[PDB]
Design a protein around this ligand. Sequence first.
Ligand SMILES: *[C@@H]1O[C@H](CO)[C@@H](O[C@@H]2O[C@H](CO)[C@@H](O)[C@H](O)[C@H]2NC(C)=O)[C@H](O)[C@H]1NC(C)=O
Ligand SMILES: *[C@@H]1O[C@H](CO)[C@@H](O)[C@H](O)[C@H]1NC(C)=O
Ligand SMILES: *[C@@H]1O[C@H](CO)[C@@H](O)[C@H](O)[C@H]1NC(C)=O
Lengths: 56, 56, 168, 56
Amino acid sequence: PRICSKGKRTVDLGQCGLLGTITGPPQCDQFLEFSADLIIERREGSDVCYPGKFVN
Amino acid sequence: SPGARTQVNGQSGRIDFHWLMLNPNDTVTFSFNGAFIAPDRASFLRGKSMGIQSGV
Amino acid sequence: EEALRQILRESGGIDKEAMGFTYSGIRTNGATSSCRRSGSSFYAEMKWLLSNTDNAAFPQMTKSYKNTRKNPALIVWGIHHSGSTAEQTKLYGSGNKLVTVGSSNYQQSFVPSPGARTQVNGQSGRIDFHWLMLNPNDTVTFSFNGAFIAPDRASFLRGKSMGIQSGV
Amino acid sequence: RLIEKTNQQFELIDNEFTEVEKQIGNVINWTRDSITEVWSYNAELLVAMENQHTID
Ligand SMILES: *[C@@H]1O[C@H](CO)[C@@H](O[C@@H]2O[C@H](CO)[C@@H](O)[C@H](O)[C@H]2NC(C)=O)[C@H](O)[C@H]1NC(C)=O
Ligand SMILES: *[C@@H]1O[C@H](CO)[C@@H](O)[C@H](O)[C@H]1NC(C)=O
Ligand SMILES: *[C@@H]1O[C@H](CO)[C@@H](O)[C@H](O)[C@H]1NC(C)=O
């Protein structure tokens, strides 16, 4: 019941989304230049801080 | 398109992010008259990896 | 249309809840010869919004609907493209028209395009219908300047089912 | 022969947290149901074959 990751780099995006890593909200300040072999998205992650969305 | 919308996060205005994948040598041009959110920095892919979604 | 057809195939039926949407000053009946319940009529579930008289100004209005049930809502509105720019000045008056639809996860802009088309059912003007699937508690906002076909009632899914196509 | 699993790497094609367009989502769901029907039939057939061949 927990994500097994040994020897592979892992980024846990708590409160951050994958699309937020490009635009950079305050919730995604740590992962602006992130690097990993395994990326984990959470349900709590929000992509935008000002109301909006990503086309495609 | 200026118009009244529902209130999310205390702001009625909304924002759309659009993306392109530029080619190893291609020139992108941004001729705008306003309502433009310019990128500060580009984004470049690093390698390969996988992406998962979980809550554990 | 195909995604909405797939939704309505596994709809199991549709439940209608009255979207209030009171309008002041402007007419809201609508009349066309091609669409006949008896004499001249429009869609039963959609309301055509015209000016009070011909060649008159259309006031800008914002109408909002709130979702109160625990199931997703189906909201279908319409955008009218006139058969000519003279017909658009006759129905809605002069000036550019803009319809803005707002939601938590939906936003889209519509501009009507007056132009001559081929004659289908005796009418040169044409109508688009656009749809969204509202969330168990999302507020949809319809800020329009004209060329808007407002829904009379929402649509709510009932259960599960299947949809087939046959001629027997 | 049987215990060894695949080396093919599969990605996410559906966001569980946020829904995909409903046309390509229905196409993806139909394809996944057809694929798992094929694999379930192959699994039942393989188990029956190897049990019968072991007894014989
Ligand atoms: C495709 O199938 C998935 C299930 O495999 C559907 O996802 C479920 O959607 C319902 C709402 O309709 C949720 O209550 C479930 O929690 C979802 N399950 C999972 C595992 O995510 C999905 O809706 C289907 N897509 C379409 C377009 O019908
Ligand atoms: C390639 O990049 C250079 C400068 O970085 C630019 O001047 C040139 O126009 C680019 N070429 C193309 C084909 O876009
Ligand atoms: C959600 O439902 C409540 C039920 O009381 C309603 O008052 C509200 O306006 C609805 N809309 C929102 C805030 O999404």
